[PDB]
């Protein structure tokens, strides 16, 4: 149905240990498809999914040049940020960027993004209107004024409304076997007695893609949101994800509890119980 493309930049200084490292990774949904690393022996954009490999040589050389130019630009950006924040040249700092587009089932732009961070804090971001900026502080206001003057937002908008959506459409078609295949969770409930009169019921979802999922326990049809232990969704290593949710229940009262699983690879909306 709905899909995303994002590129993620990290530029990290390391005084005493060479020049700042610049990395780019590109994703479609929860699938990594391209990477660049300035520390590579031969730095270039590399394919990381089968369906991107059929892009021609011109693609790969254009893409690689963008990132090689960005390695130099972001080194300059890091130097500039030291000045803006009155920081010494002895510390390690990080600029991050994430940008891209979300598209709906018809392949039309839902929304565009272009967000930056400095040292893990918001710095400047393109607003949803694709025409104005939000700066987090007076240093980022200096960048905003520069980018307003150069009409950067207009160029962003053109990319996000054009090339971003057009290339994502193409990737989704070339990768349709995987990118447009939702893998439902394989789901079970396990039983772990804590003590004589309480047990843990753990509801498991394994092998699913994309990562988005809902796992909830109900007691007598009532959500147990305050009392559910929920782990972060984690990658299995095979493109798929795992998650679990656990409740501690009084022994004997196990069948009062149901696990509810929503995932775009389902149907329905699954309901699970402990099965002795």
């Amino acid at each position: 149905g709905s899909h995303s493309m994002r590129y993620f930049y990290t530029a990290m200084s390391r005084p005493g240990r060479g020049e700042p490292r610049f990395i780019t990774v590109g994703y479609v949904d929860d699938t990594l498809f391209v990477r660049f690393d300035s520390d590579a022996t031969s730095p270039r954009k590399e394919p990381r999914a089968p369906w991107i490999e059929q892009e021609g040589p011109e693609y790969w050389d254009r893409e690689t040049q963008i990132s090689k130019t960005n390695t130099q630009t972001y080194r300059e950006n890091l130097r500039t940020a030291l000045r803006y924040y009155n920081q010494s040249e002895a510390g390690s700092h990080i600029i991050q960027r994430m940008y891209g587009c979300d598209v709906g089932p018809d392949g039309r732009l839902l929304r565009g993004y272009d967000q930056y961070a400095y040292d893990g804090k918001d710095y400047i971001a393109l607003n949803e209107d694709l025409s104005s900026w939000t700066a987090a502080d007076t240093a980022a206001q200096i960048t905003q004024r520069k980018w307003e003057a150069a009409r950067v937002a207009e160029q962003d908008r053109a990319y996000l409304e054009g090339l971003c959506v057009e290339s994502l459409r193409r990737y989704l078609e070339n990768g349709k076997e995987t990118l447009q295949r939702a893998d439902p969770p394989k789901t079970h409930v396990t039983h772990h007695p804590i003590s004589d009169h309480e047990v843990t019921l753990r509801c498991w979802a394994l092998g699913f893609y994309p990562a988005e999922i809902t796992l909830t326990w109900q007691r007598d049809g009532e959500d147990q949101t305050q009392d559910t232990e929920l782990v972060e969704t984690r990658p299995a290593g095979d493109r798929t994800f795992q998650k679990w949710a656990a409740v501690v229940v009084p022994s004997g009262e196990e069948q009062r509890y149901t696990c509810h699983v929503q995932h775009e690879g389902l149907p329905k909306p699954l309901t699970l119980r402990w099965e002795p």
Partner: peptide
């Protein structure tokens, strides 16, 4: 495909 944003710097 990436955006080649011209002269964009902090």
């Amino acid at each position: 495909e990436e955006n080649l944003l011209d002269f964009v710097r902090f």
